[model samples]
Target: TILTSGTYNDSLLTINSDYDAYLLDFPLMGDDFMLYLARMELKCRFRRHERVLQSGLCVSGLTINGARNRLKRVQLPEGTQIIVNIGSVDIMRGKPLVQIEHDFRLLIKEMHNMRLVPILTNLAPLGNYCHDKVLCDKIYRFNKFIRSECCHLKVIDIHSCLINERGVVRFDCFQASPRQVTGSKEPYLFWNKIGRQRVLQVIETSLEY
Candidate 1:
C-alpha cells in the first residue's frame, strides 16, 4: 500500500491508499447534492485518463478539499504513482521555496520507501492577480523551483501551460458556464472549468513515468 504525504499542485495521490483516506462525517446541506455530483464527475474524468484503472466500478476521488491539511492515512498497492498538488504556492514566498524543496525530498524518500512513484505538479497561477501582481510573483517562484527540483520524478507542468503572459491563470481557465458552476462560493479555486482541462492536458504532455 502507498503511504505518502506534500504541498498545492499538492493533491492526494496513487493506487488509492487507506493512509490518507478520510471519513466524510459532515451532513449534506443545500447545494450539497450538486457539489457531490460535480466532484464525482471530476474523479471519473481523472480516472478515465489513467490507464491503471480498467474498471468504472470503483471510481472515487481521493480529494478531501476542506480537509487537505487534516491527518489521514492510507496504503495503496506497491508502485503506485502519487500526485501531490499544492495551493500553498501563493504563499510560497513566506513559506519559501527552500522549504518546499525539503518537503518534496522528504516526500520522495517516504514514498520511495513505500514503493510509490512521486509525481509533482507545477503550481498554477491564481486565475486573477492578487494585490497587484504580488501573489503571481510568488507563484512564479514556486513553479520555477518546482520544475528545477522535480528532476527526481515526473512533473505535471500545469502552471506554465495555463499561465498567461500577465502571470495569471489563462482567461480560459474557468471552463464551466456560469449557471453550470453556480453552487459553490468559487469552489475549485475559482479555477473550476477550463482549469480541469488545462490540468489534464499538461499532465498528458509532462508525465513521463
Candidate 2:
C-alpha cells in the first residue's frame, strides 16, 4: 500500500449539467452584427432555465467565412439545441448566396455530427442605408432558400414580423447613430429596445417550450 496523506484526502467528483440551448450568431457591432442582440433576447427568455450557453470564443469582426472552422472548435455537447442566427454579415459584405448556402449546409452537417438540433432564423431585413434596397432583395432571396431547404428542421421566420405596412422594415426598430457632422439619426447596424423586444416575442412564441 502507498503511504497515505493526512486525513486520506480525496478530490470530490463533480458533474456539470449541460446547457439546454446555445446561441451562435454574428457580432452586434461593425457591419451586419447580430449575436449580441440575439443573445440579449435568448438570455431574457432562458433566464429562468439557467442553461443558455454562450461561448467566449466570439471573435470581434467574425464573419460567416470563418464560422465553419470556428464552430468546430466550440464545445457543443450532444443533445444541445443550437440556435443558428448567422449569414447577415456575409450578405452585407456581398458574399454570394451560393457560397453562403454551401456554408450553411456544412454548418448543419457539423451540428448533426454532434447530435445537436439546429433552430435556424432567417436573415433580418436591412434598413435603408446605401444600396440597402439591393441587399434587402438578397436577404429576401436567401431567406426563401432557408425557408424551403431548412424545412426539415425548425426555421423561425423573423423577417416578416420586422417589416412594416409600408413594405419595409419598421423604422425606430434599429439603433440611432449620429448622422453626418451633427446628430440626426442613422438606423440599421443594430437593434433598439423595441426591436429587440419584438424579436424576442417572435422567438419566444416560435420555440417549443
Candidate 3:
C-alpha cells in the first residue's frame, strides 16, 4: 500500500501498477541476471526514514547493517516481573487471524528473563481499526501489564512541547514513560507531535546507572 520512487543509472525506474510482476521477469535476462539482482538488492535496502529507538540496548548502534540488531534492544533486565493484557482479538473469514494473546506472553517471557520489567498498557480499542490490530493490541497490553507486574514501576505520560515551551528538538535517544501517554482522550494526535523531551526527562530520572 506504500508507493515509492527510485532512480538507477541516472534513469528513473518506473513500475506502474505491476511491480510485483516486473520482479519475476528479472530472471529471464540470462547473463544480466546478476546485474539485475544486485540493482534490486540495493533498491530494496534504501529507506527514506532512518529513525530508531535509541536505548543503550542497541547492540552495535545504528548502521545499515545494524538495522536487524535493533530488535534485540527491546529485551528487559533479568528477574523482572511482567503483566499481560488481551486488548483486542480479531477473526478474519472465520479464522482467528489476529489476536493479542499467545504471542504477547512469549514476548513478555523473553524480556523478563533479560532481567527487566515489562508491562501491558491500555487495550480498549480492539475492533475499531482495520489495519494491524493484533500487533497494536499486543503493544498496549504488554506495556500496561508490565506496569502492574512491578508495583514500583509507575506509568507516566508527558507532552514534549508542553514542557519545553521553546519548541526545541534534537536527535537524541531516550526511553518512553507513562507521563507521555496523554491518555485515551485525544486519540488523533500523531506520534511525532507528542512532547518527546518531557518523556525523555522522565526516563532519564528513573535510570539506575
Candidate 4:
C-alpha cells in the first residue's frame, strides 16, 4: 500500500479507505517534504500504522457547489484525519475571505457527517513578495479567521510557521517567484522544506495518539 504501519508497498495502496491521513491541501503544501514527512512519521508518530494521500488541488473552496464536487470525490471515511487548507486565490483575486471560510465550513460539515476529522490550516505567509498590499491584507485576514475558527477543531497554523519578524511570509519560504508547473506532483510557487516540516509537525502533534 502507500506505507501504512511500516510498509511502503505500492501494491498495498488501494483506495481512499486505506489511508490514515489525507493531506487535503493545495500544491504549495509541499511535494518532496510532504513525502519525507510521511516517511518521517512512520516510526515516531501513531503506532502500528501511518499513511498519507497528497490530495493537493487548485481549489479554494470559495464556492459551495465547487467544493462539493471536490469533497465528494474523496469519499473520506470515518476515523481518518484530513489535513486541509483553502488556497490564497480568494484573497489574491479578492473573492471575499468569508466566502472561502464559510464554504470551507460547509465541506468540513460534510466531512463530519461522514465521520471524518478535518484538520484546518491557515495560508502560509507570502514573505517579502507582497506584490499587492490589498491582497496581502486579505490573506492575513483570512488566515486569522482560519486560526480562530479552528480553535475547537484540529488546526495546522502554516501562517505562523512561515511568518518572519514582520509577520509576513518568511523570505526563505518563497521558492522561485511563486511559479506553477503542472504535472503529477506540482507546487504552489512558494514554501520550502522548513515551512513544510512545520506543516507536518502540526500533524505529528495531532497524531500522537
Q: Rank the candidates by lDDT, best first.
A: 2, 4, 1, 3
| RMSD (Å) of each candidate, 1 decimal | 10.8, 10.6, 18.0, 9.1
Candidate 1, 1-209: lDDT as tens digits: 23433331223233232222111211111122212222533332223443322111122221222212221223456775545554342152244545555655555566577775655666565553444365566667766777776676776666677767875556676533333222223323445555655555565556433
Best by lDDT: 2
Give lDDT tens digits, candidate 3, residues 15-91. 11122111222211001111122234312121122232111211112221221222243333345433222222221
Tens-digit lDDT track for model 4 on 1-209?
33553434333232332232233321122232333344353221211322333323222222333444445444434675655555454444457766777766676677677776666666665554477687677777777776776678866665666666765566665555554422223234545566556666765565565
lDDT, candidate 1, at 73: 29
Tens digit of per-residue lDDT, candidate 2, span 70-145: 5554555567665566777677567887888887787778768868677777877765553567777778888998
lDDT of each: 0.43, 0.56, 0.28, 0.50
Sort all candidates by TM-score, best to worst: 2, 4, 1, 3
Backbone clashes in model 4, listed as residue pairs: 1-12, 1-13, 5-49, 125-169, 127-169, 178-189
Error of 4 at 130 (Å): 1.6
Task: Quote the lDDT for 51 in model 2.
Answer: 28
Weakest ten-residue segment in model 3 by summed lDDT:
26-35
Number of clashing residue pairs, candidate 2: 1
